[PDB]
Structures are given as structure tokens and as C-alpha cells.
Structure 1
């Protein structure tokens, strides 16, 4: 595939976007859409987050990593569904505003299951 940049959309905490866009970020000036869509910190329904995840991880052809706040422990099923391939979006679950990287992370769950 081609080069791309990361995104972070999980409604638990968007402060991770504020703490990461200083060094790494993504917007689409050609598409006039901020690829690093905020998570609203719980101010939006999960439907919008799922739609954005589908657009980024199933409509975007350019491939890069993607991040997710503590909602990654909430949307684990959708994470397992979209994590079938490392491309276009290899998901990740940063801690964000609280320590939220337990054994409940989908990637960590798969690693433990195959452990």
C-alpha cells in the first residue's frame, strides 16, 4: 500500500489527541477532513465513532497505525472485527487520561489467548 498517518478516535478521552498531535497528527487537506478526528471524551454516541472507524480502516486506501483511548476496552468486539489485518489501520490502545491498558485490550487479549 501507500504511506499514511495515524488517527485516534475512541470516545473515552480525546486528551490523548491533544497530547500526541504535538508530534504526530493527521488531517486531509485535499479532503478537508481532519484525519485525527477527536473522540469528544464521551460527548458522542458510539455510532459516529464506528462510522469514523469504518471510514478510516475500511475506506481509506493509505495504510498507517491508529490509536484508541479507554473506549478500546468498550468496543472490543468491533476492534476484533476490524483488526483482521494490519492494514489499512493497525489499531492501538494508549492509556489516554487514565491508566487503561489492562488485559482487556483486544490486541493484548489475542496475545494472551494465543499465549
Structure 2
């Protein structure tokens, strides 16, 4: 669909600030909804991550690509693995304050079979 234009970010502020600096996001006053759900270390629970994942994927047709920290996805790792659709283009973005491992990817799990 051509509505696959906006980009979703669920990541720590150290990355979200820079991403918005690059000009990827904006403010959507029609719903007063940012293009991202800011993340606070040791202050944000896991149910919020699941709710925002569902909202971005199955409630918002705007998102084309989703960027989520490895540790944030760890809170919804089961949810991420269970959901596998081409529309949102879920992508486990590297996370600041953590040296990202390019082997925790839910997408790469299917790559790990049938080389």
C-alpha cells in the first residue's frame, strides 16, 4: 500500500533524538501522536511496548518500517516472534548504551534455517 510512508521508532532517547534530527519523524496533531514511543530505561514497563507495537502495526497503516531496540524487543520478544507480516517491516534496530548483537533478530531466526 502507498500509505506505507511513516516510520515507527521504539528506542531509547539517545537514538530517537538523533533519528528525529535526521528528519525521519514529525508531530501528528491530527491525533497528537508522535512517530515514535519514547523509551526510558528502568521506567517503562513491557505492556506499554506490546500496546505500542500493536498500535503501530495493526492500528496504524502509516508505518512502513519499525525500529526497536534489542532490549525493548526483549520485553516483547515473544510478541515480535509470533507476529510475522510483510507490511510493517519490523526491524530490530541497534540500541544505544548497549553493543547491539546482530543475532537476536526475530527476522534472522528464519534465516538461521535452510542456508
Specify every segment of 5 or more residues in structure 2 that has no aligned partner in the other structure, as ranges.
none
SS at structure 2 position matched to 1:66: strand
SS at structure 1 position matched to 2:16: helix
C-alpha distance 12-19 of structure 1, shift in aligned 2 (>3 A): closer
Aligned length: 115
The answer to which of 92-101 and 73-82 deviates more is 73-82
Matched-pair contact (CA < 8 Å) for 2:8–2:63? no
Question: TM-score, structure 1 length as denominator?
Answer: 0.73
Deviations 1:27-51 (A, max 9, x none): 3221111121211233111001110
> For 1:83 and 1:29, how far apart are their aligned partners in 2?
29
Matched-pair contact (CA < 8 Å) for 2:49–2:76? no
C-alpha distance 107-33 of structure 1, shift in aligned 2 (>3 A): same
> For 2:101 and 2:16, how far apart are their aligned partners in 1?
14
> For 2:67 and 2:107, how far apart are their aligned partners in 1?
12
Structure 1 residue 26, shift from structure 2 partner = 4.2
C-alpha distance 114-40 of structure 1, shift in aligned 2 (>3 A): farther
* RMSD of aligned alpha carbons: 2.9
C-alpha distance 73-114 of structure 1, shift in aligned 2 (>3 A): farther
Matched-pair contact (CA < 8 Å) for 2:11–2:39? yes
> For 1:9 and 1:78, how far apart are their aligned partners in 2?
19
Query: Which has more strand, going by share of residues?
Result: 2
Question: TM-score, structure 2 length as denominator?
Answer: 0.73
